[PDB]
Design a protein around this ligand. Sequence first.
Ligand SMILES: [Zn+2]
Ligand SMILES: [Zn+2]
Length: 216
Amino acid sequence: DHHMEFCRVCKDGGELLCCDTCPSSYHIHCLNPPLPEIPNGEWLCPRCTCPALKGKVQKILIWKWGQPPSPTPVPRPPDADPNTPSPKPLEGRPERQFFVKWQGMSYWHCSWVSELQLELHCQVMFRNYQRKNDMDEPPSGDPKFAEMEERFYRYGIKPEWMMIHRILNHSVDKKGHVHYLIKWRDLPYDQASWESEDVEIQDYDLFKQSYWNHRE
Ligand SMILES: [Zn+2]
Ligand SMILES: [Zn+2]
């Protein structure tokens, strides 16, 4: 009935693989990784199989090129010579990866999402980010420090944004786990966020007892 008559990747027409649960259409050679032939039965396009975000995106911090997926293997043609090598597997390509700050979550919960995810679920924010950033080459900007530098700081996070300034309130789960509302250093109060009792925040215990002394 109604599918794109034109590839969602390159915007050309011709032999198109059409999704079974959305209007999208693709060339088999434009998928990542490419396909050697139109499969049979059900096919779900990369957009319908796209994982869901764990929350609302507040800010795109940095991006990097991710690793290409495993190539698509090509069956040997049925009339092949035993000495003929099997066809080269169909090579994929890198996709952009984005390190994001989540709405209502502290910089402890920053995590990576794909370009396909932002394109689907945060397209306004993402199209704004593309406009302000060179998207061809990513920007470049004590055991525990090396672990924090490696995971958070190198990606554009001030250490202070992950240090406690004040604990403002508490809450108890249905399961009895205590949760604390944390004001973070170098960030306004509207960036305070609920954090688990069990997160390994520097001096966590010292701010907990300071909070309860305030209740006295
Ligand atoms: Zn195409
Ligand atoms: Zn689809």
